[PDB]
């Protein structure tokens, strides 16, 4: 019926953490902040012409950031991109679409 919505929130795997860690620096360079801790906690996916990942990463103390990461179709062999991020986010803030 409803086509194109992200999945329900799934808890990070090793894949989740690797995808985050790929994009770590791009964040750090856009935010003008170095994150000492960078731990994937949760995710959602959505299927586009590729895959958007929406990732809650524990960065901080009780301090989180949400990531919107673009992964291309395999045949395209483009690197992962940090399309957008959200800052000053909480453990209990819902991963929503942005």
């Amino acid at each position: 019926m409803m086509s194109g919505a992200p999945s329900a929130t799934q808890p990070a795997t090793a894949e989740t953490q690797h995808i985050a860690d790929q994009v770590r620096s791009q964040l750090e360079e856009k935010y003008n902040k170095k994150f000492p801790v960078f731990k994937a906690v949760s995710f959602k996916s959505q299927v586009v012409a590729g895959t958007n990942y929406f990732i809650k990463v524990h960065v901080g103390d009780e301090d989180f950031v949400h990531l919107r990461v673009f992964q291309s179709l395999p045949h395209e062999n483009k690197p992962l991109t940090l399309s957008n991020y959200q800052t000053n986010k909480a453990k209990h803030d819902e991963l929503t679409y942005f």
Binding site: M1, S3, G4, Q46, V48, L73, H75, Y97
Partner: protein, 212 residues
């Protein structure tokens, strides 16, 4: 109904598009069926605007997902512009129909195929291009590069595409991922398995425009 249908071979199908990183497949799926019924009815093959449905369907959620039925409904209530007039930007903006003058065309309504029914689906595809859904989340789906897809895939359907023809043991689908995916943007998906969801959930949810 024939053994084979291919609406491309009857000039009813426009080139393969790319939806990019927006969840606008429902807009895309709808537009293929609009382009198909108008050619079939008028003798003319045009391109109509996916970006207008994206901006303007307020029952759908832009790049965050939405419904082919309500998108087909919008075109039966109001109309649609040409793609050249209201081009795809891959991001939802405000709805700009009114500032693009009159709609290029309109349809009379929408019908729904009887779900979970292969034969029902094939009869409708023998009439015109139909909007169908499948499960596209899987890596094998994404990795598809040709042949008749038998899976694997589940029936957690997440993606609206258009059925533009059939043969003895497939149904031919136009996807919105570019031509560098699959068979130049197409995929032939297995039918006849006795699985009533269809392969990749293919018989879940199917609509077509009515226009004379």
């Amino acid at each position: 109904i024939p053994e084979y249908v291919d609406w491309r071979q009857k000039g009813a199908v426009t080139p393969v598009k790319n939806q990019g990183s927006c969840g606008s497949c429902w807009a895309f799926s709808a537009v293929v069926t609009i382009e198909g019924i108008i050619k079939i009815r008028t003798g003319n093959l045009n391109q109509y605007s996916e970006q207008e449905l994206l901006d303007c369907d307020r029952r759908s959620y832009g790049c965050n997902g939405g419904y082919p039925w309500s998108a087909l409904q919008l075109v039966a209530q109001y109309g649609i512009h040409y793609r050249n007039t209201y081009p795809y930007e891959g991001v939802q903006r405000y709805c700009r129909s009114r500032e693009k003058g009159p709609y290029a065309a309109k349809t009379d309504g929408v019908r729904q195929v009887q779900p979970y029914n292969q034969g029902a689906l094939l009869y409708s595809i023998a009439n015109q291009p139909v909007s169908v859904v499948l499960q596209a989340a899987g890596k094998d789906f994404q990795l598809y590069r040709g042949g008749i897809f038998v899976g694997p895939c589940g029936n957690k359907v997440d993606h609206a595409v258009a059925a533009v023809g059939y043969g003895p043991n497939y149904i031919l689908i136009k996807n919105s991922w570019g031509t560098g995916w699959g068979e130049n943007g197409y995929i032939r998906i297995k039918r006849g398995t006795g699985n009533s969801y269809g392969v990749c959930g293919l018989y879940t949810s199917s609509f077509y425009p009515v226009k004379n």
